[PDB]
Amino acid sequence: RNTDTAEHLIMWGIHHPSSTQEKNDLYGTQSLSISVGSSTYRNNFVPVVGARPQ
Amino acid sequence: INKISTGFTYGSSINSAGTTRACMRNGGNSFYAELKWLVSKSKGQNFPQTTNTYRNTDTAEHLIMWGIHHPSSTQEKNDLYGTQSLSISVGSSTYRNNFVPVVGARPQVNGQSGRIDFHWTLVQPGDNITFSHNGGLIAPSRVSKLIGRGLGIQSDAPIDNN
Amino acid sequence: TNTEFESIESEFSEIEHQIGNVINWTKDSITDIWTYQAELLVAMENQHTIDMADSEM
Ligand SMILES: *[C@@H]1O[C@H](CO)[C@@H](O)[C@H](O)[C@H]1NC(C)=O
Ligand SMILES: *[C@@H]1O[C@H](CO)[C@@H](O)[C@H](O)[C@H]1NC(C)=O
């Protein structure tokens, strides 16, 4: 909630695990999801795993 | 424009025998010159999960391009790739994205009923890119490379060499 | 001044509608600047030629 007399700026992030051995330990075995909703903004994201570089 | 071969190799259950009537070479049976339309070897068996990586050893930047295929009916996708939920991801040290096949009733066009959408990214010297997929990947077999500078002109008129 | 330009507008076009409008606005503004600049420049130089030649006489 914002109780100030001026606009703010809020930042967050999402985690992309690099291997299936990671997500099942850190977060669980279910299908992860996230949704963000204000009175002016609305969006959705999903984690996805896969082999990647070093 | 110049070229360098991918060097990619695929297993016994992966092939590139798919052909489309919409492209004109020696009666019609053919596909693009430098992309491979992967499909399963046997009928009724799923596409295996495979990881593929590419290395850049040249002293200049490249341009790697690939595509993804959208079926147009549930009766189609299971034969080509399998019954599982397909998904592919691409990651370099500077790029990150994900795609998913989807199917639905669609119109008719000069070639078959279906669509494929292409994607591309730049690769830096000493940098690698990796492809993780289990179906739907129109995997390239030869990659492009751009050098120098030119001048693009877009018109319609006879040419004069004098 | 040998500045070389390159195309930004696709003649066989399939463009968006916002960025297309932004590119359209600047082209007319600069085109009007050139048309207004050029017309006054020539009309302005003609005044000197008539005045200068009359003075040499
Ligand atoms: C790409 O793989 C090669 C393999 O020899 C390695 O030396 C190089 O560091 C890798 N590049 C990146 C950007 O990870
Ligand atoms: C921009 O100008 C072009 C050329 O006159 C015109 O065809 C087009 O409708 C205009 N508006 C756009 C591209 O949004």
TrEMBL record, chain A:
<comment type="subunit">
    <text>Homotrimer of disulfide-linked HA1-HA2.</text>
</comment>
<protein>
    <recommendedName>
        <fullName>Hemagglutinin</fullName>
    </recommendedName>
</protein>
<comment type="similarity">
    <text>Belongs to the influenza viruses hemagglutinin family.</text>
</comment>
<comment type="function">
    <text>Binds to sialic acid-containing receptors on the cell surface, bringing about the attachment of the virus particle to the cell. This attachment induces virion internalization either through clathrin-dependent endocytosis or through clathrin- and caveolin-independent pathway. Plays a major role in the determination of host range restriction and virulence. Class I viral fusion protein. Responsible for penetration of the virus into the cell cytoplasm by mediating the fusion of the membrane of the endocytosed virus particle with the endosomal membrane.</text>
</comment>
<comment type="function">
    <text>Binds to sialic acid-containing receptors on the cell surface, bringing about the attachment of the virus particle to the cell. This attachment induces virion internalization of about two third of the virus particles through clathrin-dependent endocytosis and about one third through a clathrin- and caveolin-independent pathway. Plays a major role in the determination of host range restriction and virulence. Class I viral fusion protein.</text>
</comment>
From TrEMBL, chain B:
<comment type="subunit">
    <text>Homotrimer of disulfide-linked HA1-HA2.</text>
</comment>
<feature type="glycosylation site" description="N-linked (GlcNAc...) asparagine">
    <location>
        <position position="128"/>
    </location>
</feature>
<comment type="similarity">
    <text>Belongs to the influenza viruses hemagglutinin family.</text>
</comment>
<comment type="function">
    <text>Binds to sialic acid-containing receptors on the cell surface, bringing about the attachment of the virus particle to the cell. This attachment induces virion internalization either through clathrin-dependent endocytosis or through clathrin- and caveolin-independent pathway. Plays a major role in the determination of host range restriction and virulence. Class I viral fusion protein. Responsible for penetration of the virus into the cell cytoplasm by mediating the fusion of the membrane of the endocytosed virus particle with the endosomal membrane.</text>
</comment>
<comment type="function">
    <text>Binds to sialic acid-containing receptors on the cell surface, bringing about the attachment of the virus particle to the cell. This attachment induces virion internalization of about two third of the virus particles through clathrin-dependent endocytosis and about one third through a clathrin- and caveolin-independent pathway. Plays a major role in the determination of host range restriction and virulence. Class I viral fusion protein.</text>
</comment>
<protein>
    <recommendedName>
        <fullName>Hemagglutinin</fullName>
    </recommendedName>
</protein>
Automatic annotation (TrEMBL), chain C:
<comment type="function">
    <text>Binds to sialic acid-containing receptors on the cell surface, bringing about the attachment of the virus particle to the cell. This attachment induces virion internalization either through clathrin-dependent endocytosis or through clathrin- and caveolin-independent pathway. Plays a major role in the determination of host range restriction and virulence. Class I viral fusion protein. Responsible for penetration of the virus into the cell cytoplasm by mediating the fusion of the membrane of the endocytosed virus particle with the endosomal membrane.</text>
</comment>
<comment type="similarity">
    <text>Belongs to the influenza viruses hemagglutinin family.</text>
</comment>
<feature type="glycosylation site" description="N-linked (GlcNAc...) asparagine">
    <location>
        <position position="24"/>
    </location>
</feature>
<comment type="function">
    <text>Binds to sialic acid-containing receptors on the cell surface, bringing about the attachment of the virus particle to the cell. This attachment induces virion internalization of about two third of the virus particles through clathrin-dependent endocytosis and about one third through a clathrin- and caveolin-independent pathway. Plays a major role in the determination of host range restriction and virulence. Class I viral fusion protein.</text>
</comment>
<protein>
    <recommendedName>
        <fullName>Hemagglutinin</fullName>
    </recommendedName>
</protein>
<comment type="subunit">
    <text>Homotrimer of disulfide-linked HA1-HA2.</text>
</comment>
